[PDB]
Short mmCIF file of C-alpha atoms and ligand atoms in Angstrom, two decimals:
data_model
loop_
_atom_site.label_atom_id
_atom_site.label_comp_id
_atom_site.label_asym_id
_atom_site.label_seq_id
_atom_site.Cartn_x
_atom_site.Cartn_y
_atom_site.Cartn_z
CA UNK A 1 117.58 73.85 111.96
CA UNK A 2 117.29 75.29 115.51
CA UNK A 3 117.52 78.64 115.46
CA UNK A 4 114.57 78.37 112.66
CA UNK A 5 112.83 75.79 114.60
CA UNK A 6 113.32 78.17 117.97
CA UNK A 7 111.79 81.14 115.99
CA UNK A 8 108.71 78.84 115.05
CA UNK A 9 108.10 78.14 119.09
CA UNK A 10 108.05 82.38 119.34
CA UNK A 11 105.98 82.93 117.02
CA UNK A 12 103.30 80.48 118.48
CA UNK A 13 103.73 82.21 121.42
CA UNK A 14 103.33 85.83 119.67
CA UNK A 15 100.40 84.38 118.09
CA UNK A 16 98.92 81.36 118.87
CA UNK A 17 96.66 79.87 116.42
CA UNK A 18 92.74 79.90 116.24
CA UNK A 19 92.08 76.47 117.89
CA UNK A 20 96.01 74.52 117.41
CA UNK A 21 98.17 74.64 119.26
CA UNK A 22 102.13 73.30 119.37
CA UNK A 23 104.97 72.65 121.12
CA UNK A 24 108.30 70.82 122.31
CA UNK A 25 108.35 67.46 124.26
CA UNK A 26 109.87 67.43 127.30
CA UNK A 27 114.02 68.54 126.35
CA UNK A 28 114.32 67.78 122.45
CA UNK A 29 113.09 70.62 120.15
CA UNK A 30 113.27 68.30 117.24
CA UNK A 31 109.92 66.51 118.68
CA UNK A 32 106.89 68.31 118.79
CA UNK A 33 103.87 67.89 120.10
CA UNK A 34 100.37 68.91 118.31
CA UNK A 35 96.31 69.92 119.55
CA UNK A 36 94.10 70.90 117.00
CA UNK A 37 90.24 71.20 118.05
CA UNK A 38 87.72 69.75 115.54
CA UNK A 39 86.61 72.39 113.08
CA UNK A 40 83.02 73.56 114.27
CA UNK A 41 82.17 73.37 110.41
CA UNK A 42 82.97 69.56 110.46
CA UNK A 43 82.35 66.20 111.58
CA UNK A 44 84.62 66.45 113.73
CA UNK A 45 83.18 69.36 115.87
CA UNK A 46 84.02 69.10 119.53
CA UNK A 47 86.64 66.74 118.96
CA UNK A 48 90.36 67.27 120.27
CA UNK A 49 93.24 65.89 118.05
CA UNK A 50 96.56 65.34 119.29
CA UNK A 51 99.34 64.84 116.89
CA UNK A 52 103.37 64.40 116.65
CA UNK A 53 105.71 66.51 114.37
CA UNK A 54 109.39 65.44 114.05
CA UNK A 55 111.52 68.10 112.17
CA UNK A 56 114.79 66.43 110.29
CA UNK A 57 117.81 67.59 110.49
CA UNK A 58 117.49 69.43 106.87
CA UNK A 59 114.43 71.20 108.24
CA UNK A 60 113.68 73.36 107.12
CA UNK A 61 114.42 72.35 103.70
CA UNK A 62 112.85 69.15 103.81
CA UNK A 63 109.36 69.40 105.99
CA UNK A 64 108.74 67.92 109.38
CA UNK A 65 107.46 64.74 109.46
CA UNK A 66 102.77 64.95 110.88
CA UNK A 67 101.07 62.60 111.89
CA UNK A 68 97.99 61.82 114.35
CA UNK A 69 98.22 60.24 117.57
CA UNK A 70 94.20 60.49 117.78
CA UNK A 71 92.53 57.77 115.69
CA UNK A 72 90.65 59.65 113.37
CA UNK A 73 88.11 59.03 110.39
CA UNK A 74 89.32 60.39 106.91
CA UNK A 75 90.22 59.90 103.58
CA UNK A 76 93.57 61.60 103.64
CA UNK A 77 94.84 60.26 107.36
CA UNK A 78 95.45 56.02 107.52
CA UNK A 79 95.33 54.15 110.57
CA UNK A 80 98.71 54.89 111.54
CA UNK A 81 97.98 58.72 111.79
CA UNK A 82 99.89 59.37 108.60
CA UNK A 83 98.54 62.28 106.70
CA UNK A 84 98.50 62.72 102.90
CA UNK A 85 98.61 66.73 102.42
CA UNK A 86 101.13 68.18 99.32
CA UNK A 87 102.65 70.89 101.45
CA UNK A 88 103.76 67.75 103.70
CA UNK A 89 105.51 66.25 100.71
CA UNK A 90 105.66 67.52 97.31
CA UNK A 91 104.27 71.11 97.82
CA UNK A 92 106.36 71.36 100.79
CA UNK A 93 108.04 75.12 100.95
CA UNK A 94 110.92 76.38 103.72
CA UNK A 95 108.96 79.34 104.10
CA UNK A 96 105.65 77.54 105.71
CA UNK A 97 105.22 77.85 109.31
CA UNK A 98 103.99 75.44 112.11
CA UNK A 99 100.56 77.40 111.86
CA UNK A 100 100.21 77.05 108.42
CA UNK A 101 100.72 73.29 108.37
CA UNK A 102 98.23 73.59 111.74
CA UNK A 103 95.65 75.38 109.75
CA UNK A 104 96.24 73.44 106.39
CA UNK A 105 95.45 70.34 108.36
CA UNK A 106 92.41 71.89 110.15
CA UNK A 107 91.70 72.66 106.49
CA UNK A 108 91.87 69.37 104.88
CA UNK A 109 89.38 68.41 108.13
CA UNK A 110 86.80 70.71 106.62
CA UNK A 111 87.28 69.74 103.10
CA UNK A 112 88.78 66.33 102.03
CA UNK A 113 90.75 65.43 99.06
CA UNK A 114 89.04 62.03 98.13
CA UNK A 115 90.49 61.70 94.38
CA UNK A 116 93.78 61.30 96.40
CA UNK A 117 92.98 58.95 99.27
CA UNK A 118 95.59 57.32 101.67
CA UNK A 119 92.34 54.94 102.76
CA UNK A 120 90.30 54.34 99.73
CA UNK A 121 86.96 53.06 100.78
CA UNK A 122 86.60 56.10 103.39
CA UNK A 123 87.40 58.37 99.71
CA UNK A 124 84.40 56.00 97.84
CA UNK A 125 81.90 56.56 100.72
CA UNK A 126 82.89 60.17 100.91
CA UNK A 127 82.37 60.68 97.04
CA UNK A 128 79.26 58.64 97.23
CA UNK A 129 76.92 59.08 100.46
CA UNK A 130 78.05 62.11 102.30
CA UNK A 131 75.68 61.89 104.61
CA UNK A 132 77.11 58.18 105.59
CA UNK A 133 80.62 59.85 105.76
CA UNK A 134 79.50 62.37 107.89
CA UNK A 135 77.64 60.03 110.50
CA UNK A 136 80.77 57.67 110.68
CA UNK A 137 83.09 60.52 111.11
CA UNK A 138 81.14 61.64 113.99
CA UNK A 139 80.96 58.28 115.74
CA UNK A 140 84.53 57.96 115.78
CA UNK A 141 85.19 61.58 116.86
CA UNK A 142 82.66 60.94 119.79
CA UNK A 143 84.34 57.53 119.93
CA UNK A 144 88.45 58.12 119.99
CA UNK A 145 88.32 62.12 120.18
CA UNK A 146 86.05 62.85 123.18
CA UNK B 1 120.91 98.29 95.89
CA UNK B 2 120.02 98.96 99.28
CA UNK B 3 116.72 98.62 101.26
CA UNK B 4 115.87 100.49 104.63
CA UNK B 5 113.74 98.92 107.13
CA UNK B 6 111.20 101.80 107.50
CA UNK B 7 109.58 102.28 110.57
CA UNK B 8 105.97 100.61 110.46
CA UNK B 9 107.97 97.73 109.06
CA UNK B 10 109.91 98.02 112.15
CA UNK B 11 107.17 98.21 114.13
CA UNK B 12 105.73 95.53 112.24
CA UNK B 13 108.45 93.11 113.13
CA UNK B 14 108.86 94.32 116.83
CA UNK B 15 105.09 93.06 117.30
CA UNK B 16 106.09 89.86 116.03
CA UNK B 17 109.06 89.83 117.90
CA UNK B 18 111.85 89.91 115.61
CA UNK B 19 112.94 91.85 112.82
CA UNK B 20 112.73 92.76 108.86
CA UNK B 21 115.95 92.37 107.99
CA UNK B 22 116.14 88.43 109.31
CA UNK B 23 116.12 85.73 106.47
CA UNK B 24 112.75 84.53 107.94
CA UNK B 25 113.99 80.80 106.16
CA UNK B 26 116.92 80.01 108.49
CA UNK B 27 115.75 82.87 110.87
CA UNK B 28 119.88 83.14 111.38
CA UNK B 29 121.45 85.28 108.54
CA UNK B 30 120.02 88.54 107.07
CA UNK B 31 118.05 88.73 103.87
CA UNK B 32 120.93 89.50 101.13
CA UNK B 33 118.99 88.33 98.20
CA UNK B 34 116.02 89.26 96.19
CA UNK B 35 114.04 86.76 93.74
CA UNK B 36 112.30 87.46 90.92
CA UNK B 37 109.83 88.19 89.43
CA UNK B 38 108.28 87.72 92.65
CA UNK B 39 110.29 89.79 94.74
CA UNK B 40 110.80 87.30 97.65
CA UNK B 41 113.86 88.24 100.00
CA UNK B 42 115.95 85.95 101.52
CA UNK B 43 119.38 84.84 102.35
CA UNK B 44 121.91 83.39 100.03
CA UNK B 45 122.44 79.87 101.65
CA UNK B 46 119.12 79.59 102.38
CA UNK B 47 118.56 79.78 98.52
CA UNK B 48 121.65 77.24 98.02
CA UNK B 49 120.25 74.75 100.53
CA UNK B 50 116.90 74.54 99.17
CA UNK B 51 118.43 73.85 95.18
CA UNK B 52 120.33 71.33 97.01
CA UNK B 53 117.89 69.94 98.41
CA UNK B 54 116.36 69.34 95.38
CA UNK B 55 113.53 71.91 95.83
CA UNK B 56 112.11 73.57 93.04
CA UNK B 57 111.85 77.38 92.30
CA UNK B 58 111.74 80.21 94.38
CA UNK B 59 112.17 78.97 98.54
CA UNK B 60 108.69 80.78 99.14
CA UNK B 61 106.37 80.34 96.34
CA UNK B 62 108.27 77.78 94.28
CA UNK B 63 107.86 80.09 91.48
CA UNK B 64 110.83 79.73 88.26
CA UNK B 65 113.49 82.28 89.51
CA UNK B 66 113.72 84.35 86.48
CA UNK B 67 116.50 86.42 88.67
CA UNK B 68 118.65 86.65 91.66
CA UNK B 69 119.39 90.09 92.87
CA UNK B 70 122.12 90.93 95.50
CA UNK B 71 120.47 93.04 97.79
CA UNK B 72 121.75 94.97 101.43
CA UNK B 73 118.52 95.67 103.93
CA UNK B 74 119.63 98.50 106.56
CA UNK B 75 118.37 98.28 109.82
CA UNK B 76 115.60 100.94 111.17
CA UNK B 77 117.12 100.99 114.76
K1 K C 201 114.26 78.19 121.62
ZN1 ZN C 202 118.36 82.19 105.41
ZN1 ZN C 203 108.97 83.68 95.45
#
């Protein structure tokens, strides 16, 4: 896992993401440390995220464990900061960098993926008044991300 | 079957700092396999690893591997 894991820290310094960025912890490289800025097409726009990544020791045939350390306001990301996103479990592929997962979760931020919730009534309000959503989402980026 | 690195893939690769020829899965061995239909290079453990790991398909796309083709990738240099 570490020579992959030390060619994933290179290649966020050759080039570093469009608003995410990642890196090592103090002296382990298997924990990771995670910024992504609120997309400026969301409700979460001016917000700044910070999450964890832990890579197994199977990385990277098995993916690193995401999650958010900023409480955040979504229907795919619980109150622990865990994140339901397929290329984190099932759709998971050895070939996906860092700043893919980055950008897929920067993604997911922009669009949602009620019909698969991890916190179910944030998935009903989301399917039902967007505008609600969208005002609570806010709140709480204002609240826990500013 | 052989494949050279030509030279705007080296350059290419230098710009990212590293090279063609690395198995960009385990970023340790050299690519010594291609997939297909898709066409996907790798190397072989990385291929092994991933079935037993109980991934599905092709390591990149998780396409069905309809073929494995040995495969040699020559430095540019
Ligand atoms: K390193
Ligand atoms: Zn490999
Ligand atoms: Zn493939």
């Amino acid at each position: 896992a570490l020579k992959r894991i030390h060619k994933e820290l290179n290649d966020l310094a050759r080039d570093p993401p469009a608003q995410c960025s990642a890196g090592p912890v103090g002296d382990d490289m298997f924990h990771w440390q995670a910024t992504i800025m609120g997309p400026n097409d969301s409700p979460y726009q001016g917000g700044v995220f910070f999450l964890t990544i832990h890579f197994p020791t199977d990385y990277p045939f098995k993916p690193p464990k995401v999650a958010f350390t900023t409480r955040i306001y979504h229907p795919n990301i619980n109150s622990n900061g865990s994140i339901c996103l397929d290329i984190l479990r099932s759709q998971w592929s050895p070939a996906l960098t860092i700043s893919k997962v980055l950008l897929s979760i920067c993604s997911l931020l922009c669009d949602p993926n009620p019909d698969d919730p991890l916190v179910p009534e944030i998935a009903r309000i989301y399917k039902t008044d967007r505008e609600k959503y969208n005002r609570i989402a806010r709140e709480w980026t204002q609240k826990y991300a500013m | 079957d052989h494949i050279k690195v030509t030279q705007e893939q080296f350059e290419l690769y230098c710009e990212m700092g590293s090279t063609f020829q690395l198995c960009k899965i385990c970023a340790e061995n050299d690519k010594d396999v291609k997939i297909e239909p898709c066409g996907h290079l790798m190397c072989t453990s990385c291929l092994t690893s991933w079935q037993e790991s109980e991934g599905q398909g092709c390591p990149f796309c998780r396409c069905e591997i309809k073929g494995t083709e040995p495969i040699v990738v020559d430095p540019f240099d």
